Amino acid sequence: MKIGVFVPIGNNGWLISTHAPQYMPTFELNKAIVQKAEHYHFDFALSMIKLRGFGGKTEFWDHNLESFTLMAGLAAVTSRIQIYATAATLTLPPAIVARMAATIDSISGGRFGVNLVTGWQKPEYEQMGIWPGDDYFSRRYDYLTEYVQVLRDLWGTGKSDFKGDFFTMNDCRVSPQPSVPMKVICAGQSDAGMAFSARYADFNFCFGKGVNTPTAFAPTAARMKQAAEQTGRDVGSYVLFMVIADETDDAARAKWEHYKAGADEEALSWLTPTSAVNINMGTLVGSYASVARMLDEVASVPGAEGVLLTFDDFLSGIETFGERIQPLMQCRAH
Template sequence: MEIGIFLPIAKNGFIVSKNVPPTWPTWELNRDVTLKCEAAGFDFALSMVKFRGFGGETEYWDHSLDSFTLTAMLAPVTSRIKLIPSVTLLSLHPAVAARMAATIEAACPGRFGLNIVSGWYKKEFEQMGLWPGDAHFERRYDYATEYTTILRQLWATGTSDFRGEFFKFDHAEIKPVPTSPIELVCAGQSGRGIRFTAECGDRNFIIAGGNTHDVDSDVRYIRGVTEQLQAIAGPLGRKVGTISLFNVIAADTDAEAAARFDHIVAGADEAAIRTLVGQAELDKSEGMSESLKKKSMFMGLPTLVGSHATVAAYLDRIAFEAKVDACMFAFPDFTRDIDNFVQHSLPRMESRTGR
């Protein structure tokens, strides 16, 4: 099973709490985290994209780096790890995104991918005059289908005459083309989102699970979503991988990890959470925003809480039994927790060591 790091590209990472170390999204931090993970054998580093945060006492996500630019800076200082920036489709024209991706790929051939974000945070786009109206909530995957079709045309041939509902091209040219295939990652959670990923993506995030006390249920659920994805992709002649995404709160013992979790929860930044949930509730469809409503403090990410041995055992089970191809991790403390994960959890994972 591959493993990746969810880079701390925005303030305070992926936990909306005052009781986690303040995380400022600096170039130096993201460079150091990426290089540390590369040295430890991580397979990929993914950075999200965000143009507006949620405020509160922690100024949660109010400060953020640019995903494409960060990736361009990481490309020449890394040598093995795959780099995956994100694009919010409403903020960047597909022809521009295609050229930017091809330019960065030239600096890291064979290890560049792109995460497709259909867009749910209305105020993020309204502030820039880019929100097309609330109908986008229901049409976003139709928009994303056209967008990814254009990307693949331009990367494959350097030209596109695409004519659709949202985009119309007249022999557009984007050259030079990438020297290696660019993998598209998606996070379709609803039925429509899963179908989009099966038709257009190469890997799909599953944002579910995280219950170390009932691994059987998690395995059944994750395996079910994976099978649903493959049932659509298979007849199309496509193979789409599954990536599980987790916050990891670990310690030497289960009791210590639980106490750490409780301390983090006690510091919830309630003002930022209210803003987050309020925006999520504008989206009446299923998917990412639905998970944010349920698990808003942890940004909808399933959160593994347990000893290093418990965390390793959980990850092995979803690798072997739920057929997960990769896991991506975020941590409360991106400096200390990565070291502990590498030292204490990774050596216990049979899905990594091959024991």
């Protein structure tokens, strides 16, 4: 099974809590995180893009770096880990994404890929006057279909004459083309989203589910595998979990409870047994060996090819993962 790190490009990472570690996302922190992940043979690092926050006491995701320039800087200080940036497709023309991807292909020596998202959060786009309207919910995947067709032409041949409802290319040129076949990843959960991924993505990100119910997402991965049969392409699922690990199960549970006890309800109001403290994320809470075991269970779910991990504390969570959890995982014996 592959393991990636979801890098905190947003302040406080994925915990919405006065008792959680408090930190701004800086280049240097993301650098320390990704270089530590790489030291422990993490397979990839991904940042999201988040153009508007949720406020409250912790000003949750009010402070966010931009994904392509962050990952270009991280590519320059790494040498093995795969690097993925997220394009919010409403905000960047496809030929710019195509040339940015070529550029980070160059920085990284072929280690770069792109996570394509339609955008769902209307205010992220409305705030800058670029929301298409409420037709967009229904048409997101049509737009994204034309978008990726333009990227495919440009990465494949260096040119595109594509013409659709949303784009008009007139002998559009992008060169250099990527040194390696450019990976596209998607995080579709809907039927349309999974059918998008089945056609154009290398893999699909889905949400892990429950607290300490590691195989609860299985039906989502089942649907994604069914979507992939429709195109004959091999598009596995990567599953997002938060790991809250410690020396014993009791100690990890005490941390989790402590985090939930500091919940920042004001920030939580703007947004809207799993907790909203981490956006109801799939959470694995346990001793190092309990977490290793639960992650081994994820690896056995049909369709599951990797996990994307957040931590309560990235610097020491990556360290304990690599020192205490990973060496116990069957799916990492390679």
